[PDB]
With several copies, the nearest count.
Chain A
Amino acid sequence: YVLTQPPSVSVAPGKTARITCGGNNIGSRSVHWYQHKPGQAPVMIISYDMNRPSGIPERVSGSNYGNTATLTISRVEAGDEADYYCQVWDSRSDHPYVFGTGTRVTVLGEVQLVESGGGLVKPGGSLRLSCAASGITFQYYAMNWVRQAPGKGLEWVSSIGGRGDTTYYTDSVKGRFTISRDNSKSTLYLQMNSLRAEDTAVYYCAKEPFDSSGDHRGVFDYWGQGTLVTV
């Protein structure tokens, strides 16, 4: 499935910013939105088309109809300057988590996830990432790896069920990367073998919402700050 975002949007302070997300009948699917500031954990700002999480101001609103979902930010502040991504989830698909291409927005003027194991590696070599989760009972949470390569958008890499019993990979890494989980230590693992130069990226740990079975929900409601893997 393809999500189309205008590459950039410019807005004066106090004015309204509108970010579109194009998709074939996207109105029939639940669209989530993420704000991403450089060197920061992405933040979920809209879930299921128009729902604001606790802490997101009323100025931020979401819409979804026909072929276009829309993120609207009113009374724009300096703090709104960031990258914005739409995202959908199709349970019944080869690539079940899809991000938009992203939108750079310029304005004219508890739970912790801690990643480790990032570094420098020979092409064809190996590296294992860890995410130490804090303040959640880990087996109740589908967990995900999402990366950003230099000058490219957020790319979903891998997903695992709370039980450890359901695993999904993007084709790019299928056969080379292995997602695993130790619920006793509340730690998520990404074993990266047969490393390529295209794998150079910041690797983000992404939590899905609490689920009594730790099922996949299609929502990345909390992120770690990331770890750099350079090849």
Chain B
Amino acid sequence: EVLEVKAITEVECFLNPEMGDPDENLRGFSLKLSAENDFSSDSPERKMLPCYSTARIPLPNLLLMWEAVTVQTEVIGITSMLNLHAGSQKVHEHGGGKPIQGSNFHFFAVGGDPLEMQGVLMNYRTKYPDGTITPKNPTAQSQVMNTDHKAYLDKNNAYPVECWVPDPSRNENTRYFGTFTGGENVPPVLHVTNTATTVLLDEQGVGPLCKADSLYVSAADICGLFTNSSGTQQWRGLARYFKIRLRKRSVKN
């Protein structure tokens, strides 16, 4: 029930990644990946599974509502992948370590409500670990589109990236952006600049309207697989920074 624009505020924040964190010294990393389990008997270790990062930022109490108008975002520590001297398997005899490479996913969202998500599984029979929130009573229909699998991204380090996507049939009050690049040898390509901004206004010129004076930010930044000397592989993630410009917007009630 939106009126004219009323003034302006910035919120700056970073979301640390949830790649699994198999031990403290492997923060930003997943547990080593298992392989070749049958679809009948697949119990992944919780620390093997990257999850979506999310947080709810409280806004000034202020009818008026906070309207998110722009976002500046980048992935933090992209240069840390130039360490080829520690942990990585040598590309060949006398050579340097193997760069992180392979499947990656880069996603963020800004909304006046929890990001709304749809469930889809590679394997509906996957036994997901206690502590994670995955599609409930999944069927073979869950390997394609099953409209029963709706969730709110309402908990950090809980929703496995592999089970959930932003739901394009909802998120009236959220903007989301994601790219998936799959493959063994996909080179990670990441750009940084403090000159880029993303407008959050819709076709009617209205950005996300923050309900309960609350801004929601969400992200997944899986950069690719790290290959140890042993040949084992781990996901590597990086934090995402957000700067969000909000304005006061008048609404009826």
Direct contact of A and B (CB under 8 A): yes
Query: Hey, which bits of chain A sit against chain B, CB under 8 A?
Result: 27, 29-30, 47-51, 62-65, 88-91, 136-137, 140, 209-213, 215, 217-218
With A and B bound together, what is the CA distance between A212 and B16 in angstroms? 9
Say yes or no: is B203 at the interface (Cβ < 8 Å to chain A).
Answer: no
Query: Using a CB–CB distance below 8 Å, which chain B residues touch chain A?
Result: 16, 18, 21-24, 27, 34, 41, 43-48, 127, 129-131, 139-140, 156-157
Known contacts A29-B130, A89-B130: A210-B27 contact under CB 8 Å: yes
- Inside 8 A of B129's CB, which chain A residues have their CB? 30, 48
Q: Which residue of B lies closest to A51 (CB)?
A: B45
In the complex, which of the residues B41, B131, B140 contacts A91, with contact meaning CB atoms closer than 8 Å?
Answer: B131
A30-B43, A63-B41, A212-B21 provided; 19 other pairs, C-beta below 8 A? Answer: A47-B45, A48-B43, A48-B46, A48-B127, A49-B127, A51-B44, A51-B48, A64-B43, A64-B127, A89-B131, A140-B24, A209-B47, A210-B21, A210-B23, A212-B18, A212-B156, A215-B131, A215-B157, A217-B131
State whether B156 touches A51 (Cβ < 8 A).
no
Chain B residue nearest in CB terms to A88:
B130
Residues from chain A with a CB closer than 8 A to the CB of B130 are: 29-30, 48, 88-91, 218
- The winner among A29, A51, A88 for most chain B CB atoms within 10 A is A51
- Is the Cβ of B43 less than 8 Å from the Cβ of A50? yes
Q: Is the CB of B131 within 8 A of A50?
A: no
Measured between C-beta atoms, what is the minimum distance from B148 to chain A in Å? 14
Q: Residues of A contacting B127 with CB < 8 Å? A: 27, 48-49, 64
How far is it, in angstroms, between the C-alpha of A217 and the C-alpha of B34 when the chains are bound? 21
Which B residues touch A49, using CB under 8 A?
43, 127
Interface centre among B24, B131, B156, B157 (most CB of A within 10 A): B131
Residues in B whose Cβ lies below 8 Å from that of A62: 43
List the 10 shortest-distance A-B pairs measured between CB atoms, nearest first.
A49-B43, A30-B130, A51-B45, A48-B129, A210-B24, A50-B43, A30-B129, A48-B45, A48-B43, A210-B21
> Pick the contact of B24 from A50, A51, A90, A136 — CB < 8 Å?
A136
A215 cross-chain contacts in B, Cβ below 8 A = 131, 157
Specify the chain B residue showing the minimal Cβ separation from A216.
B131
Q: How far is the CA of A215 from the CA of B43 in the complex (A)?
A: 21
**Which residues of chain A have C-beta atoms less than 8 A from B139's C-beta?**
137
The reply to whether A137 and B131 form a contact with Cβ atoms under 8 Å apart is no
Closest CB-CB distance, B45 to chain A, in whole Å?
4
Complex contact B16–A50 (CB within 8 A): no
Known contacts A47-B45, A211-B157, A212-B18; is-contact A218 B131 (Cβ 8 Å) = yes
Q: Which residues of A contact B48 (CB under 8 A)?
A: 51
The answer on a CB contact under 8 Å between A212 and B157 is yes
Q: Using Cβ atoms and an 8 Å threshold, which residues of chain A touch B44? A: 48, 51
CA distance A140 to B156 in the complex (A): 14
Smallest CB separation, A197 vs chain B (Å): 35
| Across-interface contacts of B34 in A (CB, < 8 A) | 51
Can you report 8 residue pairs joining A to B where beta carbons are below 8 Å apart?
Answer: A48-B45, A51-B45, A63-B41, A64-B127, A137-B24, A209-B23, A210-B21, A212-B18
Q: How far, in Å, is A65 (CB) from chain B's closest CB? A: 8
